[PDB]
């Protein structure tokens, strides 16, 4: 059974650091930036 | 931009029913193709050939179809008339192989015909399941003792009937009949469509000499006819192949 | 924020439902810390 | 007239999941490098997509590494 579906939004950030603390602020804005666009579909 | 896609053209059923291409499947410079001529890298130059803009105008867009120790080769004839036009071909079948069902082949076969009627797929495979079951133990023989029979062979392809006579030993399996079919077409200069049809009409001839050995058990290995040069020393061959245009 | 085209046994809404179930846990995990 | 009815979902080649699957299946180590980088990206970001329950023939493809 084939279903050509759109893939999920993967948070791929341009500058790539290695410590985690420089990622969470952009990822929390990503979670606000993705779930709010996903809540209106429901 | 300005690039042709790699797919989405299957103008084959129109050439199956074009009535100038010598296809026996359906009934109802000076080159034709630039496979030896360059075009100076302008794709409009391929539109000057009549069999190519025929495929650009009358073409279609397809979706791609998506899908044992000794082979037993059984030639399977398929003769089905279907709304005026018929279906006439011949193909061997590996009876030892069951990787593809005959219903899967018939759904494959009626897609390139652009029929997909879903009752041809039953009727083709029911004939295939008939002819496999009728010949399931007649092509699996174990013939010894140097039968060395003569074979007259005929092949029917669009009023271009091929005919030969040769002595065949169906005891040594050194000569493949498909390889024997290729050596005639290489030397006579025939097209590639006689590579299956001579081999498919020889395996049926083989299982007929296999038949009389296992059904009635008639040996009849009594002087295969020669011209007193090789095997039987009479005074110290039979014929030569030909493609007769009747 | 990169999307994709792929084949799945789920339809588009169930992937969005599975996105709802995955992002809400990550929202609760990240806002708590 | 035949070049306007092209299917839009397959006008880009094969999809990325098969493109990662055929990469590990081929012996191309940079395509193996690329697809493993995509598989680890998809493992951290969307584990429901590449679950072993959804894809059963994914377990021997990692066992050979």
From Swiss-Prot, chain A:
Write out the annotated subcellular location.
Nucleus
Q: Which domain of life is it from?
A: Eukaryota
Miscellaneous notes for this chain? Present with 1750 molecules/cell in log phase SD medium.
Summarizing the function annotation, the protein's role is: Component of the chromatin structure-remodeling complex (RSC), which is involved in transcription regulation and nucleosome positioning. RSC is responsible for the transfer of a histone octamer from a nucleosome core particle to naked DNA. The reaction requires ATP and involves an activated RSC-nucleosome intermediate. Remodeling reaction also involves DNA translocation, DNA twist and conformational change.
On subunit structure and binding partners, the annotation says: Forms a heteromer with RSC30. Interacts with LDB7 and NPL6. Component of the two forms of the RSC complex composed of at least either RSC1 or RSC2, and ARP7, ARP9, LDB7, NPL6, RSC3, RSC30, RSC4, RSC58, RSC6, RSC8, RSC9, SFH1, STH1, HTL1 and probably RTT102. The complexes interact with histone and histone variant components of centromeric chromatin. Component of a fungal-specific module (HTL1-LDB7-NPL6-RSC3-RSC30) within the RSC complex.
The protein depicted here goes by the name Chromatin structure-remodeling complex protein RSC3
Q: Which gene encodes it?
A: RSC3
The stretch of the full-length protein covered here is 155 to 196 of 885
From Swiss-Prot, chain B:
Q: Where in the cell is it found?
A: Nucleus
Cellular component annotations (GO), alphabetically ordered = chromatin; nuclear chromosome; nucleus; RSC-type complex
Q: Which InterPro entries match?
A: Sfh1/SNF5, SNF5
- Residue ranges, annotated region (Interaction with STH1): 71-112
Query: Can the keyword Transcription be found in this entry's annotation?
Result: yes
Kindly report the protein's main subcellular placement as a broad class: nucleus
Kindly provide the PTM information from the record: Phosphorylated in the G1 phase.
Record keywords, A-Z: Cell cycle, Chromatin regulator, Nucleus, Phosphoprotein, Transcription, Transcription regulation
Q: Name one GO biological process term.
A: chromatin remodeling
What is an example of a GO molecular function annotated in this UniProt entry? Answer: transcription coregulator activity
Other known facts: Present with 3940 molecules/cell in log phase SD medium.
Known function: Component of the chromatin structure-remodeling complex (RSC), which is involved in transcription regulation and nucleosome positioning. RSC is responsible for the transfer of a histone octamer from a nucleosome core particle to naked DNA. The reaction requires ATP and involves an activated RSC-nucleosome intermediate. Remodeling reaction also involves DNA translocation, DNA twist and conformational change.
Which protein family is named in the record? Belongs to the SNF5 family.
**Subunit structure of this entry?**
Interacts directly with STH1. Component of the two forms of the RSC complex composed of at least either RSC1 or RSC2, and ARP7, ARP9, LDB7, NPL6, RSC3, RSC30, RSC4, RSC58, RSC6, RSC8, RSC9, SFH1, STH1, HTL1 and probably RTT102. The complexes interact with histone and histone variant components of centromeric chromatin.
Q: What is this protein called?
A: Chromatin structure-remodeling complex subunit SFH1
Taxonomic placement: Eukaryota, Fungi, Dikarya, Ascomycota, Saccharomycotina
The coding gene here is: SFH1
From Swiss-Prot, chain C:
The subcellular location is: Nucleus
State the oligomer form and interacting partners. Forms a heteromer with RSC3. Interacts with NPL6. Component of the two forms of the RSC complex composed of at least either RSC1 or RSC2, and ARP7, ARP9, LDB7, NPL6, RSC3, RSC30, RSC4, RSC58, RSC6, RSC8, RSC9, SFH1, STH1, HTL1 and probably RTT102. The complexes interact with histone and histone variant components of centromeric chromatin. Component of a fungal-specific module (HTL1-LDB7-NPL6-RSC3-RSC30) within the RSC complex.
Q: What does this protein do?
A: Component of the chromatin structure-remodeling complex (RSC), which is involved in transcription regulation and nucleosome positioning. RSC is responsible for the transfer of a histone octamer from a nucleosome core particle to naked DNA. The reaction requires ATP and involves an activated RSC-nucleosome intermediate. Remodeling reaction also involves DNA translocation, DNA twist and conformational change.
Record's protein name: Chromatin structure-remodeling complex protein RSC30
Swiss-Prot record, chain D:
- What protein does this entry describe? Chromatin structure-remodeling complex subunit RSC9
Subunit architecture? Component of the two forms of the RSC complex composed of at least either RSC1 or RSC2, and ARP7, ARP9, LDB7, NPL6, RSC3, RSC30, RSC4, RSC58, RSC6, RSC8, RSC9, SFH1, STH1, HTL1 and probably RTT102. The complexes interact with histone and histone variant components of centromeric chromatin.
Q: Which family does it belong to?
A: Belongs to the RSC9 family.
The source's superkingdom equals: Eukaryota
Localization, UniProt: Nucleus
As a miscellaneous remark, the entry gives:
Present with 2610 molecules/cell in log phase SD medium.
Q: Which gene encodes it?
A: RSC9
Q: What does this protein do?
A: Component of the chromatin structure-remodeling complex (RSC), which is involved in transcription regulation and nucleosome positioning. RSC is responsible for the transfer of a histone octamer from a nucleosome core particle to naked DNA. The reaction requires ATP and involves an activated RSC-nucleosome intermediate. Remodeling reaction also involves DNA translocation, DNA twist and conformational change.
Q: Which organism is it from?
A: Saccharomyces cerevisiae (strain ATCC 204508 / S288c)
